Amino acid sequence: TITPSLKGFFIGLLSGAVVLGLTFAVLIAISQIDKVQR
Amino acid sequence: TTGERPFSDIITSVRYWVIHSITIPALFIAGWLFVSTGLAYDVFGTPRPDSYYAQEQRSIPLVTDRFEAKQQVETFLEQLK
Amino acid sequence: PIFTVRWVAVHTLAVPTIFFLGAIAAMQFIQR
Amino acid sequence: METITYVFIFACIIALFFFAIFFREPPRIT
Amino acid sequence: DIDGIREPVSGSLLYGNNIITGAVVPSSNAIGLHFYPIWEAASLDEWLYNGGPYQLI
Amino acid sequence: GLPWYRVHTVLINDPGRLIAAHLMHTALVAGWAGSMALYELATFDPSDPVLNPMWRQGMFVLPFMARLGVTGSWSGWSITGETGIDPGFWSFEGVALAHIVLSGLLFLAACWHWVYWDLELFRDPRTGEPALDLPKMFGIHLFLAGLLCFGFGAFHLTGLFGPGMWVSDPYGLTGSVQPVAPEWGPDGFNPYNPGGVVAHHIAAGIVGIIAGLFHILVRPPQRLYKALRMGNIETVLSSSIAAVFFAAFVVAGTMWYGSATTPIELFGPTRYQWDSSYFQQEINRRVQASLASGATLEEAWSAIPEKLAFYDYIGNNPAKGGLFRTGPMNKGDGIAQAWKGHAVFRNKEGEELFVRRMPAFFESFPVILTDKNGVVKADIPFRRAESKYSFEQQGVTVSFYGGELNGQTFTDPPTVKSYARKAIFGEIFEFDTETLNSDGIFRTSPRGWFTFAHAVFALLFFFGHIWHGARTLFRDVFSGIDPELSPEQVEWGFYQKVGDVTT
Amino acid sequence: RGWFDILDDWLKRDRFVFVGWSGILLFPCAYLALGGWLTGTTFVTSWYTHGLASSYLEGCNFLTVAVSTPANSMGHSLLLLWGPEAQGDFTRWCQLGGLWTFIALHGAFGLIGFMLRQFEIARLVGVRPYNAIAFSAPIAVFVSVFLIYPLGQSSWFFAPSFGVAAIFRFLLFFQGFHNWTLNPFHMMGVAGVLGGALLCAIHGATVENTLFQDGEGASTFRAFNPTQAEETYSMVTANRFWSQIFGIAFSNKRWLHFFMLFVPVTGLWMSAIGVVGLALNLRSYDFISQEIRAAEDPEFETFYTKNLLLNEGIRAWMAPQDQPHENFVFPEEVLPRGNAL
Amino acid sequence: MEPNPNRQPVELNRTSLYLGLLLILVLALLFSSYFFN
Amino acid sequence: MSEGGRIPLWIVATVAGMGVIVIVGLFFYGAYAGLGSSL
Amino acid sequence: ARRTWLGDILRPLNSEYGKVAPGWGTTPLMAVFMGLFLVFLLIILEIYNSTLILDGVNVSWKALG
Amino acid sequence: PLGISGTFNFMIVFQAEHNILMHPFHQLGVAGVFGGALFCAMHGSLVTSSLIRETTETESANYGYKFGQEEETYNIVAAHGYFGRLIFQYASFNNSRSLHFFLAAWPVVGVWFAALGISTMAFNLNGFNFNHSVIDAKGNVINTWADIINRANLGMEVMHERNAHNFPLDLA
Ligand code: CLA
Ligand code: CLA
Ligand code: CLA
Ligand code: CLA
Ligand code: CLA
Ligand SMILES: CCCCCCCCCCCCCCCC(=O)OC[C@H](COP(=O)(O)OC[C@@H](O)CO)OC(=O)CCCCCCCCCCCCCCC
Ligand SMILES: CC1=C(/C=C/C(C)=C/C=C/C(C)=C/C=C/C=C(C)/C=C/C=C(C)/C=C/C2=C(C)CCCC2(C)C)C(C)(C)CCC1
Ligand SMILES: CC1=C(/C=C/C(C)=C/C=C/C(C)=C/C=C/C=C(C)/C=C/C=C(C)/C=C/C2=C(C)CCCC2(C)C)C(C)(C)CCC1
Ligand SMILES: [Ca+2]
Ligand SMILES: [Ca+2]
Ligand SMILES: [Cl-]
Ligand SMILES: [Cl-]
Ligand SMILES: [Fe+2]
Ligand SMILES: [Mg+2]
């Protein structure tokens, strides 16, 4: 079924996804608050 | 100007030194204790001076197996009594 | 609770640096 | 023939020094 | 004879060198720091054997 | 006037002449293939696929012809060493001739498109200006590529309508062109499974067709069209160069590590097969199987195929060459004639000794013999005065099993030493060094030369990518920055968002 | 309007530390490469991979600390923390050399990030992207030396390790095994680097010594104004001087500065090509004519054969400790040595 | 035949010729040892 | 009080620099004692 | 400019220069595909690297007999 | 020696006998020529990148500058702006005189120290020696990269001028 290396692959995949997702959620949030007035 | 307040205004400010006369010695002392209590050794797997060789052994514990390298290292550590 | 990009940039470097310097200081007194 | 080649190339380089210095396009102020 | 041990080293193109291996070879270790102009030699042949060109250059 | 490094930019708004120039480039490449093939056929010796295969002979396009099913000459031989084969028209000679003719025709078409550059087709119906609808061109060409990819997978590689591809056993002993079924399980992504090559071309072909239809039928988003400058053909040059250096790094990789598409009988073995003593291990396995089956040593070692033994020799390791050591491997160590047989070294007490092998890193290596446990038992000393392990002291002898020296034993130290010296290179062979005036210095194989050329070209093409991407995205300023570049855009404090003049 | 546009606005503000889209890649990867190196050199050993101490914690100094390559047995393993070798164990991960691929890869993506930053800021400020283009050379050098070169060899082990003395070892290894000094690509590299330094020096000095007197101070730095239209030094006087001293001189300022880009960038690129050759041991190691002659003729000697003897010394005396995985045992009697030494 | 409007004159000034020749001759002086080998 | 200027920058510089000297000096002492000393 | 038989036939294929879909169009979908592609490349890379190791997948010359 | 391979010979033997790679003056020399190269490319590319537009697409940008012209040929404010945003505002030189002085000073001082390196190693004050500097609790030597460097240096030492030494120490 799922080998340990495949499990690990999923763990890496998800770790990276969480990192990018958090980064962009934070960046988008900040940019929403801190709007460039024109 | 970039918008933020000049650094020379900050590092000459009393508030700054009130904050940092606490935070800097704290961080320093913390790293100090990270070493002096031996935690660093156990976090990074770094041999103490008495831990490079078993008493009569004289061969480096070189990792030779890629996929059970973890196990091999654990074995080498067990062989230190 | 207001941070800035400059504050963050400064501290992600400064905080570990002080910590590490304390560590290395301590290391100077280790004996074999 | 190797020696002749090395020396030939060198000689050409010296010649080039001569032309690049004494037969350069003159700089002119506008 | 760069190292003064009668073991002459070839530096020039005509004596088996290319651009990368060629060299004018330093004067002999038997000379040391002694001043060795052409006129200190008994002959040009001597002068050449001992690395006089290096000193002149 | 134009600087010399820009002369070809006159093609940028001339689609007809661009096509002419591309035609000429294609003619030149096709012609090079034809000529290269002819040169190789004029120099290739087909008489010994065992100890003188193509990869020993500095052959470069011959293996690519063989990989996809062209294995025979009109002259009657084949690279698998068969006789009286009829390859049909698609011999190596036929392929060559085909490429020459193709080249000629491309040259003519080039002339025609150069002269008749001003075709209605290249004009925009509205503005009458030269115009290439690049997104739709990308669709059309992608679709074509997909049909051809799919067709290559489903017909040629499968043998459904075509010859298949080169396959072999894990030790490169019995290679041949065979039809290959697609592999649709995870092993399709095993680089060493040919099935996966077939499945790849089928699936990626289908995907190519579908994405092609998409790129034909769906216009680019305004935002992407703007951002990537899709009106500017140089954007296509930038991204195409990127894709190509990606591809070049991939083929360098699979040439150096090996895959189903870089077989060792066409390109020679890998450096890694030597690092891990792959062939030596298989050889010892066969020998031990023979001994356990009741064979004698002479019989067990004589049962080892010369081809296998030849793989276990460092002169065939592609990581033993030199950048300016030119030509075929045969020009170095010689044209391999025969396996001499396996050398077994023994000391005066009858202990079998093993010569320490040369690693690829070393141009030269000492001669050191150990027992099975790796204890030093003999060597060739540099300084003699305090020598303990000399062959003369230790009474080292050498006996041969298999090959030309089978059953022979040598006891005189010079000869024993000579064979030991050879033993650091693995299995020992007799070479003809007079025919090519061989100089005795190892040269790399086409596996090496291919890897080199393509790694270097990939790396240079990275610069190409950077350069043309820059020229695309900075078109407005590449003759200099605006004469009146306001001191509020380049200075601080004036603007909130950089570049944005309206903040 | 639209989160994308809002976000773009924010990323591209003219703050003290420009972020940009490029910063999303640059800052974490750069920070992790640097932090990785400091962490490793301060706390981490190379006992299990090299048989070496390599951290302040073990007693190394600034010159001798390093983050070392993984063991040869790891091959070209990506050695990810969650991969098959470390299996998520941070400590074993350090012990197995994980920090080396950590730093090499976060470093590569960081370099990508930086060059992307150069493009983004060029585009936002309105200047031509030549700085980025020039940064292609550091890229070529890093990618060829730290990635391609070990990828061609047996494993990451033979990659350069990240430290001062370690790098020095890398130099000496390349001399002993590759005869790298003989390689015309390295030579072009050297010419680009030293020629670059030369141009830097000579240009700087020339401008500083053909300055117009634009103030009364004996310290001449104050007599310059950023928004001034006038050249601050005389190109005409500089040109006459160098024409009379050296025979030739720049006369075009634009050509001068482009050339200053061109020389070291081209040098580094050539050296990268040579190293790519070395990945495959495709060396400029010998001159075959030299060897044929020397083999036949025991009185024929040149600096080339002398240097080969030095190399042979290097390989024999350094290989057992430098390549521990080979388990080399070289008895005293086989070590090459000249008289007495 | 209508003349092609995309044509452009080409230039190489004398200084460029000297630089180019220098580049070629010095490259040759460098690589020739390796060509003879 | 975030007042910028309350502590004279020359005193700050002097103190900070002396600190740097002290810490580096400790490291150099460390080169002769304990680990790394060769003794 | 010159018309030809084949030029006439091909004309519609080179007639929509500059034509675009409004706004972001199918950029989201594209983003998805690019993501999937990145993941695919990561997979085959890790399989070739022996970082990802699968049952019945022997990344060796000893793959098939 | 006055030749290419001879220069390499000189370097290798120098390393054997003086460990020059571990000498801080040679290290400063390297910082000087690496740094010189870097700053060369940096200055070159920045000035190039802020040339004022004076030409068309079909001519060399260089014709945009005329020898002897009084006006500067590039936008130093633009160049400065770029470089300050690339790092931070204050690592950048807005003053061309200070900039050019730095361009002169960095490699000149670095190379001065390189010269002093060779000229002091002339009197055998050699690079740092950390051979067997790290010892474990028993007394076993724990090698560092310094010790590997030592092994290479030993190779060079024992092989150089193979017929010239009769006595165990190479005292010159
Ligand atoms: C299920 C059906 C199927 C099957 C069985 C295959 C099978 C395969 N695919 Mg295919 N593929 C398919 C469908 C399929 N494909 C579809 C539908 C698409 C979309 C069109 C593709 C698109 C695709 C691409 C783009 C590639 C493959 C490749 C392959 C081969 C992978 C093994 C290998 O040698 O990788 C070797 C290649 C890698 C491990 C990828 C390396 C990724 C690099 C590291 C990214 C970074 C590159 C960049 C330049 C940085 C380099 C820096 C460096 C110098 C340090 C294998 C034959 C690969 C191939 O052709 O190999 C010859 C490949 O590159 N396929
Ligand atoms: C007209 C049809 C045709 C046919 C049947 C052949 C057949 C052959 N050619 Mg010839 N050739 C042709 C046209 C043809 N050629 C043309 C037009 C040129 C000039 C450009 C050449 C120039 C040429 C050279 C220089 C060489 C050959 C060689 C060969 C032989 C080896 C083939 C090989 O390994 O390719 C391998 C093909 C590939 C690896 C294809 C790469 C595909 C890339 C990755 C596509 C990427 C872009 C694409 C859009 C990606 C998306 C697709 C989508 C599905 C996802 C084979 C006999 C070789 C030979 O043996 O010479 C004697 C050789 O060295 N040919
Ligand atoms: C993809 C490229 C490629 C590769 C990998 C091969 C591979 C091979 N060729 Mg083939 N060949 C090719 C293209 C290629 N060829 C082309 C284009 C031609 C027509 C010229 C040939 C014509 C040809 C002939 C006639 C022969 C070969 C032979 C061979 C074999 C030996 C190669 C050798 O000795 O290289 C040696 C490589 C070098 C010495 C390296 C050259 C490096 C250059 C000179 C560096 C230039 C640097 C540059 C000037 C610097 C600029 C600096 C500036 C930017 C500042 C090998 C299998 C030989 C063989 O054995 O056939 C049976 C053989 O006789 N080839
Ligand atoms: C698909 C590949 C490709 C194509 C079609 C182009 C096309 C172009 N390039 Mg680009 N470029 C590429 C890849 C490519 N490039 C790569 C890989 C690099 C890094 C090496 C570059 C680096 C580059 C620079 C720095 C410049 C260009 C420029 C140009 C434009 C003018 C070219 C010219 O007139 O040169 C004319 C060239 C000559 C008259 C002689 C060149 C002789 C070369 C150096 C050696 C001989 C090579 C040999 C003939 C062919 C071997 C081919 C094979 C090995 C690949 C043109 C659009 C120029 C531009 O932008 O103009 C506005 C420009 O300045 N290119
Ligand atoms: C953007 C910044 C960035 C980048 C480019 C990297 C890159 C890397 N990191 Mg680093 N790292 C970072 C930030 C970053 N990191 C941060 C902030 C931390 C602290 C949390 C770390 C801590 C860290 C550690 C401890 C390690 C790494 C490692 C790595 C390497 C392996 C990563 C991997 O395999 O991910 C795999 C996962 C992904 C790439 C996620 C992809 C998500 C995809 C795109 C989503 C797809 C969605 C799909 C399209 C939707 C379709 C819908 C459909 C199904 C219906 C790689 C070079 C490893 C390493 O260096 O080993 C030596 C390692 O051990 N990183
Ligand atoms: C004083 C220290 C001497 C070594 C450094 C000297 C700097 C100048 C040497 C480079 C000359 C390049 C060719 C001439 C280039 C040239 O023509 O320069 C000209 C430049 C400007 O000249 P001015 O005429 O405006 O000023 C010089 C005099 O006229 C006095 O006003 O000279 C200076 O700025 C001198 C500043 C020295 C002030 C002390 C410098 C301290 C440097 C510390 C370095 C320590 C490094 C330790 C290792 C990390
Ligand atoms: C017209 C015509 C014809 C004919 C054709 C022909 C005859 C063709 C030929 C063709 C050819 C016969 C071609 C060739 C080509 C070649 C080439 C194109 C080459 C190139 C090369 C190169 C590019 C190289 C480079 C290099 C060098 C030199 C050195 C080393 C490195 C390298 C590689 C870089 C026919 C009858 C069919 C029909 C139709 C009409
Ligand atoms: C790896 C890793 C990671 C990361 C980490 C980090 C990020 C860290 C950082 C770190 C850091 C960030 C550190 C720092 C340090 C610092 C130091 C240690 C410094 C020192 C200094 C000194 C010593 C100085 C010196 C000098 C100079 C340089 C010049 C002037 C003079 C003097 C002498 C003062 C994570 C978790 C993600 C995951 C796992 C892995
Ligand atoms: Ca004790
Ligand atoms: Ca002969
Ligand atoms: Cl010597
Ligand atoms: Cl003596
Ligand atoms: Fe300047
Ligand atoms: Mg200490």
Side-chain angles (χ1 to χ4, degrees), chain F residues 68-405:
Chain F
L68 293 180
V70 178
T71 46
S73 175
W74 283 338
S75 182
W77 57 259
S78 83
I79 48 152
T80 65
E82 288 163 326
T83 27
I85 56 99
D86 175 46
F89 176 77
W90 297 112
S91 71
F92 302 104
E93 296 84 13
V95 165
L97 173 61
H99 277 73
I100 299 293
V101 176
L102 178 65
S103 181
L105 294 183
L106 295 173
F107 173 95
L108 294 172
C111 295
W112 189 96
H113 273 282
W114 184 268
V115 161
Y116 298 102
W117 62 270
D118 195 4
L119 306 187
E120 156 82 0
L121 185 48
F122 305 142
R123 301 268 176 183
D124 173 67
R126 323 180 309 174
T127 73
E129 289 300 305
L132 291 183
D133 185 10
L134 299 170
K136 187 175 302 174
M137 283 170 50
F138 176 64
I140 301 176
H141 294 171
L142 181 53
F143 180 80
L144 294 169
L147 278 185
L148 186 53
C149 187
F150 173 85
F152 175 62
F155 297 112
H156 186 119
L157 294 181
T158 60
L160 185 49
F161 179 57
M165 56 182 298
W166 193 272
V167 297
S168 191
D169 61 273
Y171 295 95
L173 296 186
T174 59
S176 74
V177 180
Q178 303 287 324
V180 179
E183 169 65 51
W184 289 119
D187 206 31
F189 305 98
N190 197 337
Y192 292 101
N193 190 326
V197 180
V198 181
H200 164 77
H201 286 90
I202 299 182
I206 288 166
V207 156
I209 291 160
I210 303 185
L213 293 182
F214 164 77
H215 272 288
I216 287 175
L217 299 168
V218 178
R219 297 310 299 186
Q222 171 87 93
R223 308 202 65 145
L224 296 186
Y225 190 105
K226 253 172 57 185
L228 290 167
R229 318 293 206 266
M230 292 192 185
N232 189 349
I233 188 167
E234 199 166 16
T235 198
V236 183
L237 181 55
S238 179
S239 37
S240 285
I241 287 176
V244 166
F245 74 71
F246 172 40
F249 276 129
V250 172
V251 300
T254 68
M255 185 54 72
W256 194 242
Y257 305 123
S259 71
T261 73
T262 61
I264 78 188
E265 280 156 296
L266 305 182
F267 298 101
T270 80
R271 72 151 285 148
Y272 301 98
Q273 274 167 332
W274 181 254
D275 298 323
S276 65
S277 298
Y278 182 68
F279 298 107
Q280 179 184 57
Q281 283 177 51
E282 174 66 358
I283 297 176
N284 291 343
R285 191 196 59 76
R286 298 176 59 133
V287 164
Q288 295 302 140
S290 290
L291 293 175
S293 72
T296 77
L297 210 49
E298 299 195 1
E299 297 172 329
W301 279 104
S302 301
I304 297 289
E306 273 198 337
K307 192 177 201 193
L308 188 58
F310 199 48
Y311 283 136
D312 194 35
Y313 159 65
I314 213 181
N316 293 325
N317 178 340
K320 284 291 303 172
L323 177 58
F324 291 101
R325 301 175 182 162
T326 57
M329 290 173 130
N330 291 156
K331 173 69 195 182
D333 48 359
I335 312 177
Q337 295 306 288
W339 188 36
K340 286 202 176 197
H342 186 73
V344 176
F345 295 84
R346 308 183 169 106
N347 62 2
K348 59 185 51 191
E349 294 91 347
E351 312 172 44
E352 186 182 359
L353 303 182
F354 312 92
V355 179
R356 180 49 160 98
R357 279 183 172 193
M358 162 189 273
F361 258 136
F362 293 77
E363 294 284 344
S364 69
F365 198 74
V367 168
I368 299 155
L369 282 62
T370 68
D371 57 26
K372 60 168 151 191
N373 314 315
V375 174
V376 168
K377 292 293 184 166
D379 60 43
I380 298 187
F382 197 95
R383 288 180 170 172
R384 309 316 207 273
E386 293 168 3
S387 172
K388 298 171 283 198
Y389 299 113
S390 67
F391 280 31
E392 298 85 345
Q393 273 165 309
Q394 303 291 324
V396 188
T397 71
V398 60
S399 299
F400 281 83
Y401 304 85
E404 267 175 330
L405 300 182

Side-chain angles (χ1 to χ4, degrees), chain F residues 116 118-125 131-133 136 140 168-171 186-187 189-194 214 219-225 231 246 254 257-259 262 264 270 273 278 447, chain J residues 1-4 6-8 10-27 29-30 37 40-41 43-44 47-48 54-65:
Chain F
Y116 298 102
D118 195 4
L119 306 187
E120 156 82 0
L121 185 48
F122 305 142
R123 301 268 176 183
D124 173 67
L132 291 183
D133 185 10
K136 187 175 302 174
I140 301 176
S168 191
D169 61 273
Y171 295 95
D187 206 31
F189 305 98
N190 197 337
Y192 292 101
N193 190 326
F214 164 77
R219 297 310 299 186
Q222 171 87 93
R223 308 202 65 145
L224 296 186
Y225 190 105
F246 172 40
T254 68
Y257 305 123
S259 71
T262 61
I264 78 188
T270 80
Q273 274 167 332
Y278 182 68
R447 184 178 296 277
Chain J
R2 168 181 290 95
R3 290 179 40 185
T4 65
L6 179 63
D8 288 345
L10 298 181
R11 175 85 279 190
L13 300 173
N14 198 39
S15 61
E16 293 193 298
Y17 177 86
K19 196 165 168 61
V20 303
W24 280 101
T26 54
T27 295
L29 188 52
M30 181 192 67
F37 193 42
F40 174 72
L41 287 178
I43 290 187
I44 56 174
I47 284 164
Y48 211 144
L54 297 180
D55 288 337
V57 185
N58 188 33
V59 189
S60 190
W61 296 104
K62 308 184 68 55
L64 297 172

Side-chain angles (χ1 to χ4, degrees), chain G residues 243-322:
Chain G
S243 301
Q244 285 179 283
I245 291 273
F246 188 60
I248 60 145
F250 291 105
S251 67
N252 192 303
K253 280 198 178 195
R254 297 179 171 213
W255 166 243
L256 188 160
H257 290 93
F258 172 81
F259 189 70
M260 284 186 62
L261 178 159
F262 178 88
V263 174
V265 163
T266 298
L268 262 65
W269 268 97
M270 296 304 102
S271 68
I273 295 179
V275 162
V276 170
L278 295 198
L280 313 176
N281 295 331
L282 221 36
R283 307 145 172 169
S284 298
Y285 192 91
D286 49 14
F287 290 118
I288 296 182
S289 52
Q290 290 277 308
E291 302 295 5
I292 290 179
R293 173 70 178 289
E296 291 161 358
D297 178 9
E299 287 171 344
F300 178 68
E301 188 169 29
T302 69
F303 275 109
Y304 157 85
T305 57
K306 290 169 56 65
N307 289 349
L308 293 193
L309 290 159
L310 303 181
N311 294 348
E312 288 147 30
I314 288 165
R315 296 198 291 274
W317 285 72
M318 126 183 234
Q321 293 181 211
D322 190 53

Side-chain angles (χ1 to χ4, degrees), chain E residues 3, chain G residues 303 306-307 309-310, chain K residues 9 13 156 159-162:
Chain E
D3 297 320
Chain G
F303 275 109
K306 290 169 56 65
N307 289 349
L309 290 159
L310 303 181
Chain K
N9 184 258
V13 178
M156 306 166 217
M159 284 311 299
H160 89 294
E161 293 158 348
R162 70 209 166 279

